[PDB]
Amino acid sequence: CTTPTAVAVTFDLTATTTYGENIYLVGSISQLGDWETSDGIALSADKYTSSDPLWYVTVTLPAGESFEYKFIRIESDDSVEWESDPNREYTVPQACGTSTATVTDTWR
Known part of the structure; x- marks a missing residue:
């Protein structure tokens, strides 16, 4: 792939929460700011409304790896809460051409 096999991994929640809050995302590698929620990245809810509430964010993740990302x-x-105990993780492939991936984060 181009550059270090960069893989954009989308993060889709599962939470019908709408109290003016927002689910950001930080990671286990400098990519997501190392572990800073203020440096992580706020997410969105493109397909999250009433039926299937899933948040959404594609954060690049180059250099194949079983990364470990969690929600906040x-x-x-920037005041927040974070990963329960069992955070999450993504495996970036070392061979490809574009950059895409998946990671379902449950917020509820």
């Missing part, structure tokens, strides 16, 4: 409860400000 971010208030209107």
Whole structure:
């Protein structure tokens, strides 16, 4: 692939939460700011509304790896909550051409 086999992994929640809060995402590698929620990345809810509430974010993740990413409860400000215990992880492939992936984060 181009550059270090960069794989954009989407993060889709499963939470019908809409109390003005937002689910950000940070990771186990500098890519997601190392482990900073203020450096991580707020997510969105393109396909999350009432039926299937899943949040959404594709964070690149080059250099094949069983990365370990987790969700954060971010208030209107950078104050937040974080990974329960069993966080999550993604495996970036070492062979490809584009950059895509998957990682379902449950917020509820």
